[PDB]
Every structure is written in C-alpha cells, then in structure tokens.
Design a protein around this ligand. Structure first.
Ligand code: ZN
Lengths: 143, 92
DNA sequence: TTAGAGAATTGGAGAGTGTGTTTTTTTTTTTTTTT
DNA sequence: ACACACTCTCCAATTCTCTAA
C-alpha cells in the first residue's frame, strides 16, 4: 500500500460498557485490589479516587520524511515507546538511479495525537486492616 | 555477484527522452536580450541545460555531466552518425 | 588520424569481526516526643 | 541482540599503452 491508513483517520473510537440493568463483568465495578493478572487484555470497570494528573503533550503515530536528491517522501509508523528514525532512501526508483540521498524529518506532514497520564487509588474506607492502599496507572488519548 | 553499476550511455542520449527534446524546445527556451547584462544573459543560457541534465541522468555534478559527455561523444560511431545526420538535415 | 585489443591500477561494495549496554554536611518546612 | 566501529577481501571500472588501417 502507498501509505499507512492510520495517516488519514480523522476520528477516534471508544466502547461504552453494558448497562448493569440490562446485564456481565464490564458492568460490575472492581476495587483496585480485585484486578488480578487474569484480566490482562479484557475490558473492565474500576472504582476509586484520582491521586494525580499529568499535563498534555503530543505523541507520534506516523512520522514523515523528505529525500533531498530525488525529491521523494517516505513514512514510518510508531507503536512502541521508542523508535529509530530512518536515514537512507531505500525507494526502488531512487536506488536504481544509484541516488544515495539523505532523509530529513518533517513536522508539517507528521501525525500526532494528544496524550495524558493519570493515577487512580482505592477508597480509604475499603482498605483491609494493616495494609497499605494500592493504585493503577491510567492512559488517555484523543477527545 | 554484486549489483552492476549504472552509467550514462549513448542509448539514453538517443532515446526520445534524450537529445531530441533539446532540439525540439531550445529555440523556445532560451532568449537573449541586449536589454540585460552579459552576466545576466550568460547565466540564463545555463538554466535549461542544467535542468535538462538533471532530468536525463541525476547521478552527478553538472561539470561531470559535461565532461562525461565528451568521451562517448568522441568515441561512439552511432552517436556520430546521428550528429552528421543533423548537419545533413541543414545541408538539405 | 582513428579505433580497438590487451594490461595495469584503483574503489569501494559488502561481507565479516569484535565490541558495549541493564542497575558529612548545609539550608528550610513540618510533624512529633521530650523537658 | 541490537546498533556501531573497524578490518579485510575481491572484483570490475577506469585509464594507459601498442598495433594496424
Ligand atoms: Zn531518495
């Protein structure tokens, strides 16, 4: 494909859990102790108090580059927390012209999304005797 | 084997993309004026030849394009046949 | 005078190898037990 | 194992030289 489809998705998408009055686990709140390792991958609901909130900063999704000699553009998609930027124009036309041109990054055609990180903690009146309260890290993107 | 090297060659020049384009367009491209300086008009002549050289064969520096052209221009008989054909057309 | 056949010199493609990385105050705001 | 620094090697691109038409 010419470019990754993520580059032109102008929208965000989210799921809203089942109404408990129609009801399933996503409708039934869990305290931060009940979130065992069994739940990894699932959609759940959590009840608690927020302890701290970060301020908004951008995160990359698709990065855009320009090749100087052959005047051609290439894209890279980022999922992990870190990445290596590109540094060689591997395009077949550029290669067959033996044109070992240099790649440079561009903001004006890259795609970002808003990011924020928070932390949630269990209610003090639900802590069992002699224990210290536990907490979870929450991530938030889009609108 | 390693990948063979890519070069300028008379086949590119004799292609329709090549030298016929210059003869098809040069009369319309360049324009001198007494109304502008020597340096002005002199600079103007090189524009078209530079852009054409890039479009033909982007490997190398402009000077290297000219000096490369000298070798094949003096040696290849088919290219020389084409050139005497031009000057015969004017003898026509 | 052109050109084509053979020899010598050089460039860098690219393949290979070894390597490094995780990890006693001194000054100032606040709670607590001690005279 | 994953980017780097550095070493080694082979192969063909190039220019130079000699010969004859
Ligand atoms: Zn390129």
């Amino acid at each position: 494909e010419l470019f990754p489809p993520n580059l032109t998705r102008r929208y965000f998408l989210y799921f809203k859990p089942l109404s408990q009055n129609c009801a399933a686990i996503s409708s039934k709140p869990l305290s931060v102790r009940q979130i065992k390792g069994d739940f990894l991958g699932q959609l759940i609901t959590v009840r608690g108090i927020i302890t701290r909130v970060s301020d908004v900063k951008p995160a990359v999704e698709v990065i855009a580059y320009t090749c100087d000699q052959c005047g051609y553009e290439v894209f890279q998609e980022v999922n992990s927390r870190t990445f290596t930027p590109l540094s060689e124009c591997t395009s077949e036309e550029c290669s067959q012209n033996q044109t070992k041109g240099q790649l440079f990054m561009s903001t004006r055609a890259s795609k970002f999304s808003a990011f924020q990180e928070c932390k949630i903690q269990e209610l003090s009146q639900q802590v069992p005797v002699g224990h210290i309260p536990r907490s979870l890290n929450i991530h938030v993107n889009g609108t | 084997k390693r990948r063979p090297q890519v070069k300028l060659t008379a086949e590119k020049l004799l292609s329709d993309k090549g030298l016929p384009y210059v003869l098809k367009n040069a009369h319309k491209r360049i324009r001198i004026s007494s109304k502008k300086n020597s340096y002005d008009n002199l600079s103007n002549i090189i524009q078209f030849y530079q852009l054409w050289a890039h479009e033909l064969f982007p490997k190398a520096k402009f000077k290297d394009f000219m000096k490369i052209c000298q070798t094949v221009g003096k040696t290849d008989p088919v290219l020389r046949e084409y050139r005497v054909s031009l000057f015969r057309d004017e003898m026509g």
